[PDB]
Amino acid sequence: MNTDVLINWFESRRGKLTYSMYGSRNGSDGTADCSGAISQALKEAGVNIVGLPSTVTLGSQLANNGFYRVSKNEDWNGQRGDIILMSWGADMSQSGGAGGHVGVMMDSVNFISCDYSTQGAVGQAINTYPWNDYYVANKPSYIEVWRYADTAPQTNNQANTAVVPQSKAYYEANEVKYVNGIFQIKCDYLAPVGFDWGENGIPVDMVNWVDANGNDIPDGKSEDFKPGMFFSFAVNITDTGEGGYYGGYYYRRFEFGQFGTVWLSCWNKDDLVN
Ligand code: NA
C-alpha cells in the first residue's frame, strides 16, 4: 500500500469532482461517491480491492488485503492512511446509501473524503476537515478505523502459530478484563494485530491455569486471574470450521459455548489446545 498515492488521489481532485451515488462512483465521469472514491484510491495505491464496494462490504475487503481495525467506536491515535468507515446505524451492515460514509486520515489530525458536506456543489466533493470536528458535526453512531499491516507480505495470511513457532501450546494473558459479563483474556500471540474484546476475548472460565513453564496448576476463581498469568486449553470449545483473513494473518472462528464466537490466529482446534 502506497500511502502517498492514496492521499494524493483525493488531494489532486479538490475542485474537480461532484458528489453522486448515481454515476460512475469513482470519478471517471467527473462524479464519485464516498465508497467509490476510496475504492478507486486504494486500487491506485496498490490494494487489490475488487470492484467498487459500498461501505457495507469494504471492511471485509480491507481485512482480506492486510488491514486490521485499530478502533471500533473508540478514540485512537490517528495516522496517515487510516481508513475510517462510519454508520448512522449500529455497525456497517446498516450503512447503505446515505447511512454510511468513509474517508482517510492524511495525518494524525486531518480527514479527507468524497462527501456531501458542500451539498453537491459542482467540483466540491473532496473536502478536508480535522477529524475531531467532523465527528462532532456529523455524529455517526458507529465508526471503525482500518490500518494496513506493513508485515502483511511476510506473514502472508498464515496463522500466527506458523508465523511465530512455539513448541508448547500454552499462552500468556496480556490483559484480563471483565467484558460482557465475564472475565476475558487478551492474548497477543493469538490475536497479534487489531485485537477487539468482542472478537478475540477468551473466557477465563474456559481456560486451564498453568505456570510460566506450562505446568498444569489448580484453576482459581475467574476474578483472581491476572495479567501476566499463563493458560492452556484442555468439549464446550467448538471449532466452527470457519476461517478468515485479517491484518495479514489467518484467524479461525471458535465458539465457547453460549459465550459466543472467538477468533484466534491458529489453524484449528488441534493447533489451539493441549
Ligand atoms: Na490448571
Where in the chain are the domains? 3-148, 155-272
For 238-269, letters b (16+ CB in 10 Å) and e give ebeeeeebbbbbbbbbbebeebeebbbbbbeb
Question: What is the identity of the amino acid at 49?
Answer: I
How many Å apart are CA 91 and CA 55, to the nearest integer?
Answer: 10
- Could you give the 3-state DSSP secondary structure of residue 162? helix
Structural contact between residues 208 and 116, judged by C-beta atoms closer than 8 angstroms: no
Give the distance (Å) from ligand 1 centre to CA of residue 209.
Answer: 4
How many Å apart are CA 129 and CA 205, to the nearest integer?
Answer: 46
How many Å apart are CA 62 and CA 158, to the nearest integer?
Answer: 16
Same fold, 3-148 and 155-272: no
Give the distance (Å) from ligand 1 centre to CA of residue 260.
Answer: 23
Structural contact between residues 237 and 269, judged by C-beta atoms closer than 8 angstroms: yes
- Residue that is written with C-alpha cell 446505524 in the block: 89
Helices (H) and strands (E) in the chain, counts: 8, 18
Give the distance (Å) from ligand 1 centre to CA of residue 221.
Answer: 11
How many Å apart are CA 157 and CA 249, to the nearest integer?
Answer: 4
Question: What is the identity of the amino acid at 136?
Answer: V
**Domain 155-272: CATH class, spelled out:** mainly beta
DSSP 89: S
How many Å apart are CA 218 and CA 154, to the nearest integer?
Answer: 39
- Contacts of residue 169, defined as CB under 8 A and 6 or more positions apart, other chains included, come to 232, 233, 271, 272, 273, 274
The terminus-to-terminus CA distance of the chain in angstroms comes to 38
- Residue that is written with C-alpha cell 498453568 in the block: 210
> What is the experimental resolution, given in Å to one decimal place?
1.3
How many Å apart are CA 17 and CA 123, to the nearest integer?
Answer: 4
Contacts 24+ apart (CB under 8 A), 238-243: 238/269, 239/268, 239/269
How many Å apart are CA 247 and CA 199, to the nearest integer?
Answer: 14
Q: Which of 18, 75, 69, 7 is nearest to 44 (CA)?
A: 7
Give the distance (Å) from ligand 1 centre to CA of residue 207.
Answer: 8
Q: 35 to each of 6, 40, 248, how far by Cα in Å?
A: 13, 8, 23
**What CATH code would you report for 3-148?**
3.90.1720.10
The phi and psi torsions of 163 (rounded to 5 degrees) equal -65, -45
CA angle (194 as vertex; 189, 200 as ends), nearest 5: 60
- Could you give the 3-state DSSP secondary structure of residue 204? helix
- Could you give the 3-state DSSP secondary structure of residue 91? coil
Ion ligand 1 neighbours (CB, 5 A) are 208-209, 216, 219
Give the distance (Å) from ligand 1 centre to CA of residue 168.
Answer: 15
CA 78 to chain CA centroid, nearest Å: 14
